[PDB]
Amino acid sequence: MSQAFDAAKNDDSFYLPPEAFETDDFQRGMKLFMSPDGHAVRFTIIHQG
Amino acid sequence: KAAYVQVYIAGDQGESLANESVEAVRKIATERETPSGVKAYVTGAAAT
Amino acid sequence: DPLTEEGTARMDELKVAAADAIKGTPFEGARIYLGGSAATYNDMQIGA
Amino acid sequence: FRHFSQAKMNPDLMMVETDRDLRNPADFLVIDKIAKALKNVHGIAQVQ
């Protein structure tokens, strides 16, 4: 079931545990998409054609 | 075989400062000693 | 009744919905074919 | 354009600004909801 939901790129549900917020990957990511005080988040949108 | 990066330049699009910035970025990108087979191009709306 | 003006107008909606469902999945690049009575009469109306 | 698609050279940018810190799982749920809503708009390829 886990392999199937990963391969299909399913996105019906989402949850990120609090422990993931301490990993270096998400520490870097939150300095790339969120403001220094954490009050805002930016989205990048790409069209078709 | 390709990659891109986004760069924010001084001045607003159309202004003379923006044109100067685009030229400076192009110069910095092209003056490098590139590895064989790798070429760098500056494109975008401000460049246009 | 699928053989009306309302019925034949749903053909584009179905193709759009399927193309949007495929978007973002490993199914990207698939080919969608739609047929039936309503599609036939939609084409008939355009030709007429 | 030989490698990428045309839309990747001219992306859009959206910012959502709140008054409280958003670096907790509860706000990440809402952020993911917003991202899915933006992706489901007709004509949008992907949202990062």
Coordinates of C-alpha atoms in Angstrom, one line a residue:
Chain A
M1 CA 0.0 0.0 0.0
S2 CA 2.8 2.4 0.9
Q3 CA 4.7 1.6 -2.3
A4 CA 1.5 2.0 -4.4
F5 CA 0.7 5.4 -2.9
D6 CA 4.2 6.6 -3.4
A7 CA 4.5 5.4 -7.0
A8 CA 1.1 6.9 -8.0
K9 CA 2.1 10.4 -6.7
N10 CA -1.1 10.5 -4.8
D11 CA -1.9 13.7 -2.9
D12 CA -5.4 13.2 -1.5
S13 CA -4.0 13.5 2.1
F14 CA -0.9 15.1 3.6
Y15 CA 0.8 15.2 7.0
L16 CA 4.3 16.1 8.1
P17 CA 5.3 15.1 11.7
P18 CA 6.8 17.6 14.0
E19 CA 10.1 15.7 14.0
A20 CA 10.7 16.5 10.3
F21 CA 10.8 20.2 11.1
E22 CA 14.2 19.6 12.8
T23 CA 16.0 17.9 9.9
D24 CA 18.5 20.0 8.0
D25 CA 16.6 19.5 4.7
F26 CA 13.5 21.2 6.0
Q27 CA 15.5 23.7 8.0
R28 CA 17.0 24.8 4.6
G29 CA 13.6 24.6 2.9
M30 CA 11.9 26.9 5.4
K31 CA 14.6 29.5 4.6
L32 CA 13.8 29.2 0.9
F33 CA 10.0 29.4 0.9
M34 CA 9.1 31.2 4.2
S35 CA 9.9 34.6 5.6
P36 CA 12.6 34.9 8.4
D37 CA 9.9 35.4 11.0
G38 CA 7.7 32.7 9.5
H39 CA 4.7 35.0 8.9
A40 CA 4.5 34.4 5.1
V41 CA 5.0 31.7 2.5
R42 CA 5.6 32.1 -1.3
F43 CA 4.3 29.8 -4.0
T44 CA 5.8 29.3 -7.5
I45 CA 3.3 28.7 -10.3
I46 CA 4.0 27.4 -13.8
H47 CA 1.5 27.5 -16.6
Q48 CA 0.8 25.1 -19.5
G49 CA 1.9 26.1 -23.0
Chain B
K1 CA 21.6 18.3 -19.9
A2 CA 20.3 21.7 -18.8
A3 CA 19.8 23.7 -15.7
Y4 CA 18.6 27.3 -14.8
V5 CA 18.7 29.8 -12.0
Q6 CA 16.7 32.9 -11.3
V7 CA 18.5 36.2 -10.5
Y8 CA 17.0 39.5 -9.3
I9 CA 18.7 42.5 -10.8
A10 CA 18.7 46.2 -9.8
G11 CA 16.1 48.4 -11.4
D12 CA 12.7 47.8 -13.0
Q13 CA 12.1 46.3 -16.4
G14 CA 12.7 48.7 -19.2
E15 CA 14.7 51.2 -17.2
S16 CA 18.3 52.0 -18.2
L17 CA 19.5 50.6 -14.8
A18 CA 17.9 47.3 -15.7
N19 CA 19.6 47.1 -19.1
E20 CA 22.9 47.8 -17.5
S21 CA 22.3 45.1 -14.9
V22 CA 21.4 42.6 -17.7
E23 CA 24.6 43.4 -19.4
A24 CA 26.6 43.0 -16.2
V25 CA 25.0 39.6 -15.5
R26 CA 25.7 38.5 -19.1
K27 CA 29.4 39.5 -18.7
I28 CA 29.8 37.7 -15.4
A29 CA 28.2 34.6 -16.8
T30 CA 30.2 34.5 -20.0
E31 CA 33.6 35.6 -18.8
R32 CA 34.0 32.3 -16.8
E33 CA 36.3 29.5 -17.8
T34 CA 33.5 27.0 -18.6
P35 CA 34.0 23.2 -18.6
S36 CA 34.1 21.7 -22.1
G37 CA 30.7 21.5 -23.7
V38 CA 28.9 23.8 -21.3
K39 CA 27.6 27.2 -22.3
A40 CA 25.7 29.8 -20.3
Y41 CA 22.9 32.0 -21.7
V42 CA 21.0 34.9 -20.0
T43 CA 17.4 35.1 -20.9
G44 CA 14.1 36.2 -19.5
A45 CA 11.6 39.1 -19.7
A46 CA 14.1 41.8 -18.6
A47 CA 16.7 40.5 -21.1
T48 CA 14.0 40.7 -23.8
Chain C
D1 CA -31.7 12.5 -23.0
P2 CA -28.1 12.4 -24.3
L3 CA -29.2 13.1 -27.9
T4 CA -30.0 16.8 -27.3
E5 CA -28.1 20.1 -27.4
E6 CA -27.3 19.7 -23.7
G7 CA -25.9 16.2 -24.3
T8 CA -23.5 17.1 -27.1
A9 CA -22.1 20.1 -25.1
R10 CA -20.7 17.7 -22.4
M11 CA -18.1 16.2 -24.8
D12 CA -15.5 19.0 -24.3
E13 CA -16.0 18.9 -20.6
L14 CA -15.3 15.2 -20.4
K15 CA -12.0 15.6 -22.3
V16 CA -11.0 18.6 -20.2
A17 CA -11.8 16.6 -17.0
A18 CA -9.8 13.6 -18.0
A19 CA -6.8 15.7 -19.1
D20 CA -6.9 17.5 -15.8
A21 CA -7.1 14.2 -13.9
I22 CA -4.0 12.9 -15.7
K23 CA -2.1 16.0 -14.9
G24 CA 0.7 15.5 -12.4
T25 CA 0.6 11.7 -12.5
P26 CA 2.7 9.0 -14.2
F27 CA -0.1 8.9 -16.8
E28 CA 1.2 12.1 -18.3
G29 CA 1.6 11.8 -22.0
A30 CA -1.4 9.5 -22.4
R31 CA -3.8 9.8 -25.3
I32 CA -7.6 10.3 -24.8
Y33 CA -10.1 9.1 -27.3
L34 CA -13.9 9.8 -26.9
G35 CA -16.6 8.2 -28.9
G36 CA -20.3 7.4 -28.8
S37 CA -23.6 8.7 -30.1
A38 CA -23.3 12.1 -28.5
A39 CA -19.8 12.7 -29.8
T40 CA -21.0 11.6 -33.3
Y41 CA -23.8 14.2 -33.2
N42 CA -21.5 16.9 -31.9
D43 CA -19.3 16.4 -34.9
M44 CA -22.4 16.3 -37.1
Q45 CA -23.6 19.6 -35.7
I46 CA -20.2 21.3 -36.3
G47 CA -20.1 20.0 -39.9
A48 CA -23.7 21.1 -40.5
Chain D
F1 CA 13.2 25.5 -25.1
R2 CA 15.3 22.7 -26.5
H3 CA 15.1 21.1 -23.1
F4 CA 12.6 22.8 -20.8
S5 CA 9.1 23.9 -21.5
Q6 CA 8.2 27.5 -22.4
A7 CA 6.3 28.2 -19.1
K8 CA 9.3 27.5 -16.9
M9 CA 11.1 30.6 -18.2
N10 CA 8.3 32.9 -17.1
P11 CA 6.9 31.6 -13.8
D12 CA 4.4 33.3 -11.5
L13 CA 4.8 34.1 -7.8
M14 CA 2.1 34.1 -5.1
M15 CA 2.6 35.1 -1.4
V16 CA 0.2 34.5 1.5
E17 CA 0.9 36.7 4.4
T18 CA -0.4 36.0 7.9
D19 CA 0.3 37.6 11.3
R20 CA 1.5 34.5 13.2
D21 CA 4.3 32.0 12.7
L22 CA 3.5 29.3 10.2
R23 CA 6.3 26.8 11.0
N24 CA 4.1 24.1 12.6
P25 CA 2.3 21.0 11.2
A26 CA -1.2 22.6 11.7
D27 CA -0.3 25.4 9.3
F28 CA 1.4 23.1 6.9
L29 CA -1.9 21.3 6.4
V30 CA -3.5 24.6 5.3
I31 CA -0.5 25.4 3.1
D32 CA -0.8 22.0 1.4
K33 CA -4.6 22.7 0.9
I34 CA -3.8 26.0 -0.8
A35 CA -1.1 24.4 -3.0
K36 CA -3.6 21.8 -4.2
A37 CA -6.2 24.4 -4.8
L38 CA -3.8 26.4 -6.9
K39 CA -2.7 23.3 -8.9
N40 CA -6.3 22.3 -9.7
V41 CA -6.8 25.6 -11.6
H42 CA -7.3 24.8 -15.3
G43 CA -4.1 25.6 -17.2
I44 CA -1.6 25.3 -14.4
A45 CA 1.1 22.7 -14.8
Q46 CA 2.7 22.5 -11.3
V47 CA 3.1 24.4 -8.1
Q48 CA 6.2 24.2 -5.9

